[PDB]
Write a structure and sequence with these properties.
Blueprint lengths: L3 E12 L4 E6 L5 E5 L20 E8 L4 E7 L16
Antiparallel strand pairs: 1-2, 1-4, 2-3, 4-5
The structure holds one RNA strand of 6 nucleotides.
PDB class: rna binding protein/rna
Keywords: Complex, protein-RNA, YBX, Cold-shock domain, RNA binding protein, RNA BINDING PROTEIN-RNA complex
Assembly: dimeric
Length: 90
Amino acid sequence: PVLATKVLGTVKWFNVRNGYGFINRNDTKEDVFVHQTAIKRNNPRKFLRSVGDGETVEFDVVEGEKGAEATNVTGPGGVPVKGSRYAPNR
RNA sequence: UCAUCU
């Protein structure tokens, strides 16, 4: 079950070293947790799993253990995310 | 799951 699909949001922050971040939903203005494994289309020219602070992402919302979370996270229209400056380019 | 990392 998916609570919401293709939600658009702005990354609040994402910690590359520790592997998680938060996205602010553009529709409800609620922060949602995003795990590194929830990123579906990583920047193919970085080599870590990440989204970058402030970038615009598109995602599904599902029920987590500590609140609703983001999953299937991509750029708008399913394109690769930009990724974090804390994740070096190849 | 509110982290603090080039």
